[PDB]
Design a protein around this ligand. Structure first.
Ligand SMILES: O=c1ccn([C@H]2C[C@H](O)[C@@H](COP(=O)(O)NP(=O)(O)OP(=O)(O)O)O2)c(=O)[nH]1
Ligand SMILES: O=c1ccn([C@H]2C[C@H](O)[C@@H](COP(=O)(O)NP(=O)(O)OP(=O)(O)O)O2)c(=O)[nH]1
Ligand SMILES: O=c1ccn([C@H]2C[C@H](O)[C@@H](COP(=O)(O)NP(=O)(O)OP(=O)(O)O)O2)c(=O)[nH]1
Ligand SMILES: [Mg+2]
Ligand SMILES: [Mg+2]
Ligand SMILES: [Mg+2]
Lengths: 112, 112, 112
């Protein structure tokens, strides 16, 4: 297992940490949502939660990433939920497919 | 009407407040986006805004929730904007279909 | 080029800055994702990043906006990544098609 801290940013001002697919995978529209492995695991830094979002270059090439919420205390593997929009999409091993954004986790009095 | 404060978190580290559908609804791909009732109303806590996002277990079962922005001062009913991706999806009353994330509302000098 | 500061909010409590299309464009489902011009450019205020999200009235009319991350130091044109869901969608010049949300950019020790 590899932690969040192993992820990298494209540039200092890049909002997201890049997430790569660990397998070669082919996706077609009729397959619907698929969960792609990353080999990267939660949990997140205290007081933060994560959002998985698409990279625009990948979205424009026809692979939609469904935004996903990563809970602060999640300790499982971060998977990318993805669907081919219109056409056959081929993802190669180590391709940068999504990005992880970290956001503040607001406290509320909501019952847990 | 029920306020945000009545919503619940799965767990202390869960980023989202769960949103349930108040009706039994069937969705097919050809129907396009549908607004599902929740019986839950704005407004939000001061200096925050909301984002409606899908639950991953639901996304992977073929129901896409379109991310929605809930404005701080919205006082209407929070509805879930949803679409069946590929197949017929059946939502039962009280099923947890989406989640509400609260985020800080940044001030800017943009004209209003 | 026009900066972010020229954008406007619907109302004081509106989380988003409105983004309008600079061209008349027709979209059909088979076309897949399209990048719509806005004539608005980065960069963003220090310590913030942007998220492009759909307006709910537009989503419910059948035009999906793919959430997009705007990096702090992006200096290019902000484009709206959009797809007609089920039907033919016609976007007119100056129509409000998306919104820009500003969020805090969290610092991490991730290698850049
Ligand atoms: O795209 C995603 C979304 C979620 N996740 C993981 C991280 C998060 O902590 C966990 C829970 O996600 P959701 O709350 O959105 N799913 P759900 O509500 O269906 O499951 P649970 O009831 O356990 O919260 O699933 C992913 O790995 N990828
Ligand atoms: O998924 C959603 C998205 C928005 N909303 C509500 C809450 C928000 O305050 C209100 C406005 O949403 P948008 O700003 O995204 N819609 P639009 O720009 O089309 O309407 P308005 O011009 O009034 O802001 O709609 C939902 O109930 N569900
Ligand atoms: O919907 C979008 C998404 C991104 N963008 C721009 C702003 C952002 O700074 C830039 C990078 O977006 P992504 O990081 O999501 N794309 P990608 O990872 O494919 O490119 P890069 O490797 O340069 O980061 O693209 C848009 O204009 N519209
Ligand atoms: Mg990127
Ligand atoms: Mg959940
Ligand atoms: Mg709006």
């Amino acid at each position: 297992k590899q932690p969040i801290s192993k992820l990298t940013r494209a540039t200092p001002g890049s909002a997201g940490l890049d997430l790569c697919s660990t397998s070669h995978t082919v996706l077609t529209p009729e397959m619907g949502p698929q969960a792609l492995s990353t080999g990267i695991y939660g949990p997140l830094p205290p007081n933060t939660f994560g959002l998985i979002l698409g990279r625009s270059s990948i979205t424009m090439k026809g692979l939609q990433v469904y935004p996903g919420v990563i809970d602060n205390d999640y300790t499982g593997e971060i998977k990318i939920m993805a669907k081919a929009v219109n056409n056959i999409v081929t993802v190669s091993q180590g391709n940068r497919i999504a990005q992880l954004i970290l956001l503040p986790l607001i406290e509320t009095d909501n019952k847990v």
